[PDB]
């Protein structure tokens, strides 16, 4: 009886004592679908990475209508709670809907985004055949790192 | 292409309040097979639960020749590193043989043993259909309790 759930939670500042601080969120997937490699995952990503994802998806799916992202950074201010809640909600909604689409669901880009440590650049490398390691290997390796597996 | 790897590790003495107490071991599965629900799992089980398991598996597969469990039990002294380790070895060997067998691999008692927290009365209840939760529900809740998943 297939299901997929997604939560965006836990807004946290990164590189706070640097110039170039940013915010990121935890993305938690729970699913029983054959579509995913891992039935659970928690991963941390920033808005600019959602933006990358959205555009990568659109580019491989000419005619799909991608859901919206929330307020661009330019109009975001972490000192305003409302901004950080809205950004989180909007990012949850974006993924919820994306996940509802079978065609998108078959994009390994979405999968490494959700169930791996890999950044934009390495995702593109990996799914474009250019890496030592497969998509599965990356996701598995992430899981082990992330669950501190012995 | 498909692997299943099992380790039995990190024995620890656990203390019922008590005069008496026991050792349990950690069991860690890493696989990509469709046979398993969770691609990784860590649970802790004691030797006596392994005993339970072997007899359970035997009764759902009566023509299968089950691997032997290790055999110091009465002798066994939980304060002798060699005792405890000769036993984790044995429990590891037991399971890695067990998992090589597709008949045994389809018993949900083995899966709830490896990938959930349920004890044997509840495993039994659950595979008999006497519990509100399915087999899969239990494995999924264990993963979530155990991966301190947010709600
Ligand atoms: Na959802
Ligand atoms: Na996946
Ligand atoms: Na995730
Ligand atoms: Na658009
Ligand atoms: Na093995
Ligand atoms: Na396990
Ligand atoms: Na399983
Ligand atoms: Na009942």
From Swiss-Prot, chain A:
Binding site for a 1,2-diacyl-sn-glycero-3-phospho-(1D-myo-inositol-3-phosphate): 46, 72, 87
Molecular function in Gene Ontology: 1-phosphatidylinositol binding; ATPase binding; phosphatidylinositol phosphate binding
Subcellular location(s) of the protein: Cytoplasm; Endosome membrane; Cytoplasm, Cytoskeleton, Microtubule organizing center, Centrosome
Annotated disulfide bonds: none
Domain of life (superkingdom): Eukaryota
Record key words, sorted: Cilium biogenesis/degradation, Cytoplasm, Cytoskeleton, Disease variant, Endosome, Lipid-binding, Membrane, Osteopetrosis, Protein transport, Transport
Topology within the bilayer: Peripheral membrane protein
Record has Protein transport as a keyword: yes
Domain PX: 3-120
Alphabetical GO biological process terms: bone mineralization involved in bone maturation; bone resorption; calcium ion homeostasis; cellular homeostasis; cellular response to leukemia inhibitory factor; cilium assembly; endocytosis; endosome organization
Membership in a protein family: Belongs to the sorting nexin family.
Disorder association: Osteopetrosis, autosomal recessive 8: A rare genetic disease characterized by abnormally dense bone, due to defective resorption of immature bone. Osteopetrosis occurs in two forms: a severe autosomal recessive form occurring in utero, infancy, or childhood, and a benign autosomal dominant form occurring in adolescence or adulthood. Recessive osteopetrosis commonly manifests in early infancy with macrocephaly, feeding difficulties, evolving blindness and deafness, bone marrow failure, severe anemia, and hepatosplenomegaly.
Description of its domains: The PX domain mediates interaction with membranes enriched in phosphatidylinositol 3-phosphate.
Complexes and interactors: Interacts with ATP6V1D; may play a role in ciliogenesis.
Protein name in the entry: Sorting nexin-10
Residues represented out of the complete protein: 8 to 157 of 201
